[PDB]
Amino acid sequence: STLQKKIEEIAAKYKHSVVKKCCYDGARVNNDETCEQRAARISLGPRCIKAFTECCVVASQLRANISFK
Secondary structure: OOHHHHHHHHHHOOOOHHHHHHHHOOOOOOOOOOOOOOHHHOOOOOOHHHHHHHHHHHHHHHOOOOOOO
């Protein structure tokens, strides 16, 4: 367990943490604007932008395809 391995572990935790935040931010309902419009106002990294956009797009499809067995 080198120092390299411990830092790579922390770095991966940071990225996963960022993605998780950006995703659920995009997953929030926003009826006024499209996902592309909302993500255009994000000045953060491309990692955050992709997480935001994908979750925003997917969240919208899930909300429109919700049913009851």
